[PDB]
Design a protein around this ligand. Structure first.
Ligand SMILES: O=P(O)(O)OC[C@H]1O[C@@H](O)[C@H](O)[C@@H](O)[C@@H]1O
Ligand SMILES: O=P(O)(O)OC[C@H]1O[C@@H](O)[C@H](O)[C@@H](O)[C@@H]1O
Lengths: 474, 474
């Protein structure tokens, strides 16, 4: 007998500003690190970039009416820092704030709760130019000025806020794998920039307590719960290293203000541990979040990895199935295909029960409420004549994840809401446009913007029914 | 490259009073629940009991001389509450204390650190008679007065104290399985008593802060780290339930003063959850230990268990490799044989890597120093001509476990000490004498009491070498 979804459960959907807005040089917006990176040749699928994206900046009113028709209870979006401070830390672009004001007003006038994400990967280029952005401590105060600017302008209308969205991705993709800006492949610099982001996070949570005393705020972590391949003790041990190094490394800082010891000692043994200043631990420990945000797509299965063993593996940005290979850290763990789950064409595992597992781990380890800030399925959609999109594959994935969330709630996990990724189809950072996630199909591809028309997919009407019945009908 | 064992690593060995002392009714000793229980027919193997045991009450000077010979840095033993307070809560028996005084002196005079366990399963029968012993809150102040008496008398000479030894075992064997006193099979009662034992532990830790400010104290938990069978999500979930239900249920109370929420809820749903009074949570939260005692012998592998499936299973008393059967909780998990490790003839897993995993989990979850209070291998020893016991089997098991500890310390776990189980062969609670754990063979079997002469096994000299080389030579 399942607990019901609670009465104020934030049934939501989400986007990120670069992926959706366009208008990259309008109304005073400065360059982000992503405006600049995606235009370097070879960085992105087919040269795709966010110049136009799906033009949500101009078309937000249409998108909001669609949200209202779906009956959305919450919409999570991010603010483009480079629209508010074109040079990152100088004078404010009022026109940039005015767009988010019009957006928020449009949401409120249809009864939709705004969830504001402060940072979704788009630090202004001028901060990268002046001091290397997340690699310098200067960013702590610059990010704080920006956050407080938002808090003051919108704090009376926005109760739910997300600080850093998937810090583990933007930091590791940016500084270890070289796949995101600034395109660095240097572990030492990765862990230093990570430490600085931890500080910036805590700093803004602290300012939030002053400026938005009734709000709720948290970071959002990209969480792939680890599993051991089997009961072989070395594989279990690899599991312990993987969960600690990939997951606790961030979440313990967010929840407890502390890095876990074994991962710290491994880094220290390699000269990789971050530089710690007087006052750092005190800041990090005094900034407890109201919730842990969680972005969940899949779990990861691991096995023993000897010290001469696997390092970086092949990622899959095409969509040919079976092309991904093992990744790891030599001597600690490496990934392996989980034989007991399907995968998408991009090799992401489909593991709804894993969401239950990850939610149960976070409650068990931190006792924190959880806002699920992203979850969804990306696939090719076919637009059929008569503006029809039958995305049963997406419904099937959403249905099963939302069911497991109900199981977690029944187990006692305090889940505040669920934001499907994404509302409209949007631009993939690297993969272009054909890997779609939306409830609302957007008519464009990697080569032409077409008319950018919005077309409700079958999943739209499915989620609309989920919301109308508060989850009883899936 | 391994770190070495720290310079004052407490290389130890251990026992428990009932298992070793005898003298069950000498010098004013009152009856314990085990004195009564073991005499009930068919409870113990061939009616074996501890009237005499291995007669350590009278032979302690020989036993301590052999310890000094081995070079032991520490010796962990329990105090028999019924020697000290024959009625549990009336007047103190000075001759009871006097024995422990003499034993401590004997240990100091040979430079051996004594480790005093307050409770190893032998509560005075009068307290079971007067008010149900662990089922009543009265035991809390009674246990406290007993512990404070010890603190006052031996505080100046004993730095390391263990409070409750293997609470999960005496509670569970005593109130769920009915295998130990008080011979009950009733979960409501188990959890009530469990709760009272939690409070007792916290009360005496508090008292200890007042009475022995420079001492170190903690409970010691019987820890079988759980593993999932494989990476099937339902199997990993079953691992989450098992580790939380079997392990965190106790350790999070010792570390953080609170029960895990999901297990609590599941209890609450069955009507099994304990009764809580004003002040319980404040007391439990306020009783932080200096370390976690860990008694380790094996890990457990678990798998999905449906609502109709396994509950209580068959244990293995006989020694016939193969006779154990899955045990579980319907709906949550059940055990299953781990194909990747070996077992003893009693179906106990041999899994030294499990100990490193276990020590890594406690450090990762709680950040506590650990004192391994028991680890050991139980088997038949043959005494061969020339006073030779060739216990290679035993050396092999202990060596591998000590190696894995060194690895844990190298990972960053703070391990204060290791106490092999046991110094001399002793009496098993249920299984008699033939299943031996000692470094020192004691000349008796289940029939013939013979002379109880101490004979040094091969392992004795193995461990002698280990201590001499602070663990470099194994
Ligand atoms: O499957 P993709 O196209 O590589 O994208 C993954 C998505 O999921 C998360 O990784 C990001 O927060 C999103 O911004 C992104 O859209
Ligand atoms: O039943 P066995 O094989 O003798 O093992 C029991 C041992 O197991 C441990 O659980 C106890 O703390 C010891 O007191 C005891 O010696």
């Amino acid at each position: 007998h399942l607990k019901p979804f609670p009465p104020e459960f934030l049934w939501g959907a989400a986007s990120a500003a670069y992926q959706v807005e366009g208008a990259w040089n309008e109304d005073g917006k400065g360059l982000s690190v992503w405006d600049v990176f995606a235009k370097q040749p070879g960085r992105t699928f087919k040269g795709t970039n966010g110049d136009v994206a799906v033009d949500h900046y101009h078309r937000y009113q249409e998108d909001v009416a669609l949200m209202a028709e779906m009956g959305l209870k919450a919409y999570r979006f991010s603010v483009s820092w480079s629209r508010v401070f074109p040079d990152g830390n100088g004078a404010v672009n009022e026109k940039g704030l005015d767009f988010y004001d019009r957006l928020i007003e449009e949401l409120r006038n249809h009864g939709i709760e705004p969830i504001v994400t402060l940072y979704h990967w788009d630090v202004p280029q001028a901060l990268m130019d002046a001091y290397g952005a997340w690699e310098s401590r200067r960013i702590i105060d610059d990010f704080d000025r920006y956050a407080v600017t938002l808090f003051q302008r919108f704090g009376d209308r926005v109760k739910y806020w997300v600080t850093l969205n998937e810090q583990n991705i933007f930091i590791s993709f940016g500084y270890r794998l070289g796949l995101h800006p600034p395109g660095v492949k240097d572990m030492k610099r990765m862990y230093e920039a990570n430490h600085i982001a931890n500080l910036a996070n805590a700093k803004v949570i602290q300012s939030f307590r002053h400026y938005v005393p009734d709000g709720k705020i948290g970071p959002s972590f990209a969480y792939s719960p680890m599993y051991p391949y089997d009961s072989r003790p070395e594989n279990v041990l690899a599991f312990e290293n993987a969960e600690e190094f990939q997951n606790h490394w961030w979440m313990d800082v967010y929840a407890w203000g502390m890095y876990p010891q074994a991962a710290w000692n491994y880094l220290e043994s390699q000269g990789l541990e971050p530089t710690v200043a007087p006052g750092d631990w005190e800041l990090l420990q005094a900034a407890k979040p109201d919730f842990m945000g969680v972005n969940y797509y899949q779990t990861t299965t691991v096995e023993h990895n000897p010290p001469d063993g696997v390092g970086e593996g092949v990622m899959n940005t095409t969509g040919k199935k079976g092309t991904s290979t093992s990744s790891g850290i030599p001597g600690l763990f490496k990934t392996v295909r989980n034989p007991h789950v399907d995968t998408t064409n991009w090799d992401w595992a489909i593991d709804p029960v894993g969401l239950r597992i990850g939610l149960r781990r976070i409650a068990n380890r931190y006792q924190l409420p959880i806002l699920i800030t992203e979850n969804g399925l990306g696939e090719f959609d076919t637009l059929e004549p008569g503006d029809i999109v039958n995305d049963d594959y997406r419904i099937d994935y959403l249905r099963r994840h939302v069911q497991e969330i109900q199981r977690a709630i029944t187990d006692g996990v305090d889940v505040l809401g669920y934001c499907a990724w994404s509302f409209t189809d949007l631009l993939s950072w690297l993969n272009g446009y054909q890997k779609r996630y939306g409830f609302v199909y957007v008519n464009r591809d990697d080569e032409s913007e077409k008319d950018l028309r919005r077309i409700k997919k079958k999943s739209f009407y499915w989620y609309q029914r989920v919301i109308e019945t508060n989850g009883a009908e899936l």
